[PDB]
Write an enzyme that holds these catalytic residues in place. Sequence first.
Site, PDB file in Angstrom:
ATOM      1  N   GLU B 160       0.889  -1.170   0.036  1.00  0.00           N
ATOM      2  CA  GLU B 160      -0.385   0.239   0.227  1.00  0.00           C
ATOM      3  C   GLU B 160       0.865   1.367   0.032  1.00  0.00           C
ATOM      4  O   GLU B 160       0.884   2.225   0.870  1.00  0.00           O
ATOM      5  CB  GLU B 160      -1.050  -0.247   1.780  1.00  0.00           C
ATOM      6  CG  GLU B 160      -1.761  -1.647   1.141  1.00  0.00           C
ATOM      7  CD  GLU B 160      -2.709  -0.860   2.381  1.00  0.00           C
ATOM      8  OE1 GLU B 160      -2.229  -0.124   3.546  1.00  0.00           O
ATOM      9  OE2 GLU B 160      -3.671  -1.961   2.211  1.00  0.00           O
ATOM     10  N   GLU B 240      -6.335  -8.383  -0.412  1.00  0.00           N
ATOM     11  CA  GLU B 240      -6.938  -8.771   1.512  1.00  0.00           C
ATOM     12  C   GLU B 240      -8.524  -8.614   1.547  1.00  0.00           C
ATOM     13  O   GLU B 240      -8.639  -7.235   1.471  1.00  0.00           O
ATOM     14  CB  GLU B 240      -6.515  -7.264   2.287  1.00  0.00           C
ATOM     15  CG  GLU B 240      -4.946  -7.839   2.169  1.00  0.00           C
ATOM     16  CD  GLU B 240      -3.354  -6.954   2.992  1.00  0.00           C
ATOM     17  OE1 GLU B 240      -4.413  -5.479   3.305  1.00  0.00           O
ATOM     18  OE2 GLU B 240      -2.411  -6.108   2.846  1.00  0.00           O
ATOM     19  N   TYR B 305      -8.235 -11.908  15.144  1.00  0.00           N
ATOM     20  CA  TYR B 305      -8.885 -11.094  14.157  1.00  0.00           C
ATOM     21  C   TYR B 305     -10.165 -11.198  13.658  1.00  0.00           C
ATOM     22  O   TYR B 305     -10.715 -10.902  12.713  1.00  0.00           O
ATOM     23  CB  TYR B 305      -8.352 -11.487  12.489  1.00  0.00           C
ATOM     24  CG  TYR B 305      -8.169 -10.420  11.760  1.00  0.00           C
ATOM     25  CD1 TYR B 305      -6.858  -9.376  11.608  1.00  0.00           C
ATOM     26  CD2 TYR B 305      -8.511 -10.606  10.617  1.00  0.00           C
ATOM     27  CE1 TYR B 305      -6.644  -7.980  10.681  1.00  0.00           C
ATOM     28  CE2 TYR B 305      -8.157  -9.444   9.658  1.00  0.00           C
ATOM     29  CZ  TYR B 305      -7.507  -8.275   9.991  1.00  0.00           C
ATOM     30  OH  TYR B 305      -7.010  -7.429   8.965  1.00  0.00           O
TER      31      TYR B 305
HETATM   32  C1  LIG Z   1      -6.539   2.430  14.032  1.00  0.00           C
HETATM   33  C2  LIG Z   1      -6.775   1.774  12.904  1.00  0.00           C
HETATM   34  C3  LIG Z   1      -5.892   2.601  11.908  1.00  0.00           C
HETATM   35  C4  LIG Z   1      -5.762   1.016  10.812  1.00  0.00           C
HETATM   36  C5  LIG Z   1      -5.225   1.291   9.518  1.00  0.00           C
HETATM   37  C6  LIG Z   1      -5.007  -0.662   8.677  1.00  0.00           C
HETATM   38  C7  LIG Z   1      -3.997  -0.091   7.703  1.00  0.00           C
HETATM   39  C8  LIG Z   1      -4.649  -0.773   6.061  1.00  0.00           C
HETATM   40  N1  LIG Z   1      -3.317  -1.234   5.976  1.00  0.00           N
HETATM   41  C9  LIG Z   1      -4.016  -3.227   5.339  1.00  0.00           C
HETATM   42  C10 LIG Z   1      -4.997  -3.774   5.947  1.00  0.00           C
HETATM   43  C11 LIG Z   1      -4.956  -4.413   7.211  1.00  0.00           C
HETATM   44  C12 LIG Z   1      -5.396  -4.398   8.469  1.00  0.00           C
HETATM   45  O1  LIG Z   1      -4.987  -5.465   8.973  1.00  0.00           O
HETATM   46  C13 LIG Z   1      -3.180  -5.003   7.060  1.00  0.00           C
HETATM   47  O2  LIG Z   1      -2.200  -4.031   8.632  1.00  0.00           O
HETATM   48  C14 LIG Z   1      -2.396  -5.009   5.734  1.00  0.00           C
HETATM   49  O3  LIG Z   1      -0.866  -4.810   6.564  1.00  0.00           O
HETATM   50  C15 LIG Z   1      -2.447  -3.901   5.141  1.00  0.00           C
HETATM   51  O4  LIG Z   1      -1.818  -3.518   4.282  1.00  0.00           O
END
Ligand SMILES: CCCCCCCCN[C@@H]1C=C(CO)[C@H](O)[C@H](O)[C@H]1O
Lengths: 605, 602
Positions: B160, B240, B305
Amino acid sequence: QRMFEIDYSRDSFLKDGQPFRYISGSIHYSRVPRFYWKDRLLKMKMAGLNAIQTYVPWNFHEPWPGQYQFSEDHDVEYFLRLAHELGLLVILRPGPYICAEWEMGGLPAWLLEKESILLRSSDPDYLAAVDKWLGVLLPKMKPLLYQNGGPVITVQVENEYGSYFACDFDYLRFLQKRFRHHLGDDVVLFTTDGAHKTFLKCGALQGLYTTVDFGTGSNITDAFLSQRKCEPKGPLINSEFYTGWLDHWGQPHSTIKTEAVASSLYDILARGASVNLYMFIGGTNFAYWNGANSPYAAQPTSYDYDAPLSEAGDLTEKYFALRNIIQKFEKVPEGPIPPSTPKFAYGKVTLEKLKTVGAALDILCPSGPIKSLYPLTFIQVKQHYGFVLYRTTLPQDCSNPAPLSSPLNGVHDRAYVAVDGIPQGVLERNNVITLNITGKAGATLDLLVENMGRVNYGAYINDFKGLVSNLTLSSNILTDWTIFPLDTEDAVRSHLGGWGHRNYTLPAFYMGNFSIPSGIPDLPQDTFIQFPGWTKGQVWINGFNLGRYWPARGPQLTLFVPQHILMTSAPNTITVLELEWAPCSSDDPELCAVTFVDRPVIGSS
Amino acid sequence: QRMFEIDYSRDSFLKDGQPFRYISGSIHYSRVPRFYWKDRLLKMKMAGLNAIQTYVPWNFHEPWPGQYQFSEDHDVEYFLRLAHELGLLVILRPGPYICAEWEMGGLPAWLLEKESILLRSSDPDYLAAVDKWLGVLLPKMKPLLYQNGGPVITVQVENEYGSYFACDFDYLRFLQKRFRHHLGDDVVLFTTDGAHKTFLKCGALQGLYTTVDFGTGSNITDAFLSQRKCEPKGPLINSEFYTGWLDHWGQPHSTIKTEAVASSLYDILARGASVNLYMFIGGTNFAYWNGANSPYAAQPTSYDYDAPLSEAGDLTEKYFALRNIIQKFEKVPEGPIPPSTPKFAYGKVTLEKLKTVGAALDILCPSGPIKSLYPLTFIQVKQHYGFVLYRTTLPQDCSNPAPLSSPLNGVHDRAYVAVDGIPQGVLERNNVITLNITGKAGATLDLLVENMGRVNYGAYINDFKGLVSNLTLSSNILTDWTIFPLDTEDAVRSHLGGWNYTLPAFYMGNFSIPSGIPDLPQDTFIQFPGWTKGQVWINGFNLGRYWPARGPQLTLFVPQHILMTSAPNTITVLELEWAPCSSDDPELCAVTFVDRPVIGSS
Ligand SMILES: CCCCCCCCN[C@@H]1C=C(CO)[C@H](O)[C@H](O)[C@H]1O
Ligand SMILES: CCCCCCCCN[C@@H]1C=C(CO)[C@H](O)[C@H](O)[C@H]1O
Ligand SMILES: *[C@@H]1O[C@H](CO)[C@@H](O)[C@H](O)[C@H]1NC(C)=O
Ligand SMILES: *[C@@H]1O[C@H](CO)[C@@H](O)[C@H](O)[C@H]1NC(C)=O
Ligand SMILES: *[C@@H]1O[C@H](CO)[C@@H](O)[C@H](O)[C@H]1NC(C)=O
Ligand SMILES: *[C@@H]1O[C@H](CO)[C@@H](O)[C@H](O)[C@H]1NC(C)=O
Ligand SMILES: *[C@@H]1O[C@H](CO)[C@@H](O)[C@H](O)[C@H]1NC(C)=O
Ligand SMILES: *[C@@H]1O[C@H](CO)[C@@H](O)[C@H](O)[C@H]1NC(C)=O
Ligand SMILES: *[C@@H]1O[C@H](CO)[C@@H](O)[C@H](O)[C@H]1NC(C)=O
Ligand SMILES: *[C@@H]1O[C@H](CO)[C@@H](O)[C@H](O)[C@H]1NC(C)=O
Ligand SMILES: [Cl-]
Ligand SMILES: [Cl-]
């Protein structure tokens, strides 16, 4: 240093000079795979038992004369060591007759080679075989005696001899003298009998401490009064306080209420009595080890017994209730209790017909048949357990049905009949002594005879097996027999020779495989095998004989399958010997199948 | 021989010249003990997945520069060979940055020895570090590519990057070049970004196939239109598709309803898209591996999760429901599925105080402290994870409460304060920047500072840790520090060398499990009733952090392979705040093993 004795003055046992009372549970090492001995013993210790009780089945250890089995699942020395290592004491009951819903009461069938032998008596032939067995078994038990540093505190002589007809006091004195000779003069020797003078009359002997047995139905005061008659001084002892009861094929599964066992246990304990719970875990009669009662009724494969520990070793409500009772009298071990094992539903496994018994005669009987003018018994053809095929030809045309009959009711115990490969139905000890057959003159008449279990109690323990008397056809004695002892065990282990040597259907072997993955920490698990659509027979998994199934009669539908006989990666081979009717005819191969489930069904509606 | 490629005609993949669509689930080998790798992977296969997807956390394999861990639980190569043996293809996500609710998004903390480093950019020192790491990792991956007879079918570049502020395309081009140099020209390389033009702007690159990610709340038509705007031809791919969501200490446990996952899954599959379920099993952040988000909020030890497989690998209702959706498209393998593992309640185990942190400094810091006029960071004193003790002396008398403050919010992330061995309370990043202390002049002021996990997402991933700015006492900058890095892992293993609040302390006890019992040991869950905040080890294995005072996680997962029957098992707890152990009643100084997890407490 080490002493265990009766204190007559004080109505007590002395253990190294200290007052001692035992709280014991029966476990039979011959009914639990060695893989699980430690599991059951530890569960027994955690319940608060300070001792265990067991039988030594003579035939389990000497299936042929002078040919002994003391290794693996037969290693009684090891079992007794394990009990000791867990801090349990042992009450040993070495027979030589044990009853126990076990084949012939533990007596070896080869004793019957003298047709007129009087079992459990001073018959000199019976005595010489007993004496030779004691000269082997007892010196092994000697270092296991409490005084020589092992767990064995008391040893029972014979088993409820007062329930048997012979009333031979010379036999009992002979056992006493030999037990003393091999074990020494200190070891406590006792007898056990029903709690009534009529049983005590022939079972008690001077110099052997008299104990009684009784269950939740008995008046405790009355029972202990009968014991006090023979032993005015010394500890009160119930050697078999019934936690449940035995079963028979075709009868509803026996149960005894948890509350009934708990309350009786409390009252027994409150008298200061020593007591043994029969059974604490019952387990399984694998292979052909089950017994039977007269008039002829066989006990099934499961010896669950409705015991506090279930067939597969599970903690039941009864277990916790009995533990709670014990806690009122003694401090129980601390810490969590080993759990009931995980059970796994492997699902449906299709089988297919490999060969009929007729077709497999070469591999089943590789030394060939015995020929005889009239039929011989199992014992005469040197077969003890399982099946023997009796063969002759029809001495007259039977285009019209002709009665095949055992006029003296001498089919012991069940015969599966075929004429030229056409199944004709079944003859049955007591129930059906005549069967109509059809076929041409000179056709091959086959009777596959199953020993369903030698009677283990009462006068008729000299239960020969096979065609024990003549068969007639249209009233005339059938002569000229070709008789095949069948080594079903070897044959199944070689996959009927396939692996070399490094209405009714014909009796036949059905085989199928199933795989279990490797590298999975929790597989294999214990399971229960079920036989929807099958009728009656024997089952092996990886050549281990699990026992007899008979969903046609019940109460037992499933059989217990311990996980240690199952393998991963390598296919697990199921062999079914179906005797009466297999669900394997029609197009649908999916019907020719067994199913593994994760709960036992030993007592269905 | 073997080929895997994008076909722009049929808008799909061709595996060996035939149309192929993957249905994948995420499993992170760094979050599941190797003992259980085959169990989780087989359960995945039995669900009807034809592929798995995983991240390679750089910091899991290169904890110090030039010092590598690829053995046992760190054996990524074996894990992929295992996926292959079981007939599963692999989508490899080697980062170098992975996000993933994982400490610093997988970036090693030693990158921060250059204090001005711009992580995730063409910063030359960052590139040079990355390039050396790729030179160790990617040649290991090359034999495992599909074309060379392994399971790896596609490889993600970065993670990302469109969500990061830097927008440095030369960084993405460098990665593409290096991946191509080590893996060759055939491997399908791709990127993943949020499903909206604003995220794809800085995330997508020519030569790298653009995929999107999104969960059950998103319009699936729109999500895929934004992908299509970037890739007019080729497979639709949700890299994802969220089966659940992450947690934060002190926030309610996240859950996503089965019906929502099944419904969206069927919708995505029906379109012919390739999809990866994130997470399929989440597992555990053992030791100090958890991450954090900004404004500062750490994720907990559990990475359950609300996944289809539970933390401990259990088959859930969500599991069977997605399997049934997959069945509508593909025949799933026959036979029984491996079971949820048996769980055993070992019960209550009493612990005794071993030593306070104060008393174990010889053992925790055998090199002796570092002296500094002002405070140093974790990085500067050469520690990455765990705990660092900052020590000074009080300059003026403090008979009356005096404010001890970090006026710049510079306690990263939590400090446990004592004056002459009298606990004072706690300073907390973004929350409590001032605490009143008392004590006599010359008293020993101690601050035990916890790295609670480096932020793994957003601009503030360069998260240093320690006292990152000065402390003041009665507005005066405190100076002259004696700073002890603490070797907690070694000390715990050595039984600390001896082979209101309380002072941070180690408590230890032991329990036996019988041998020769076919079904013990079993998995279990440890629980800390009466305790507050700390770290726990069993047989020297660091299971993670407990914090029943904040929740939502109360129990920690304990896998059975670390439990023994030949010798007693030792539990060691490092309690940071308050231990139920003063009490006349030693029975209260105790933990409990239970047979069910509690990860969603209110
Ligand atoms: C304070 C909450 C903010 C959460 C932001 C999430 C980041 C989004 N990135 C994607 C989704 C997730 C969630 O499991 C993982 O971190 C993945 O590694 C990421 O690619
Ligand atoms: C069908 C009638 C039942 C026969 C009863 C058997 C004789 C009882 N004696 C005792 C009790 C049992 C029962 O489990 C065992 O057989 C014991 O070995 C025997 O000592
Ligand atoms: C059992 O028998 C004794 C007689 O010895 C008697 O006292 C007691 O009341 C009996 N228990 C009953 C009737 O349940
Ligand atoms: C056998 O057949 C005869 C007819 O000849 C019949 O009377 C008899 O009932 C049959 N017996 C059995 C046992 O079926
Ligand atoms: C068989 O019949 C004959 C002739 O009556 C008899 O002598 C013999 O004892 C019988 N045998 C058996 C085993 O019943
Ligand atoms: C069952 O397994 C055994 C051992 O490999 C083999 O000999 C037999 O042929 C098998 N048959 C099938 C259908 O797998
Ligand atoms: C999603 O968006 C489209 C427009 O792009 C709209 O037609 C459709 O109904 C939406 N679907 C759902 C499920 O909301
Ligand atoms: C510290 O104590 C002083 C005086 O008692 C008080 O004014 C101040 O609010 C306190 N600050 C904190 C953070 O407790
Ligand atoms: C602390 O204070 C001194 C004096 O202002 C300053 O030089 C230094 O940069 C500060 N250090 C930190 C770590 O904030
Ligand atoms: C070992 O186990 C016992 C039982 O809890 C305990 O009393 C003892 O403190 C333990 N030994 C240690 C922690 O060294
Ligand atoms: Cl017994
Ligand atoms: Cl992933």
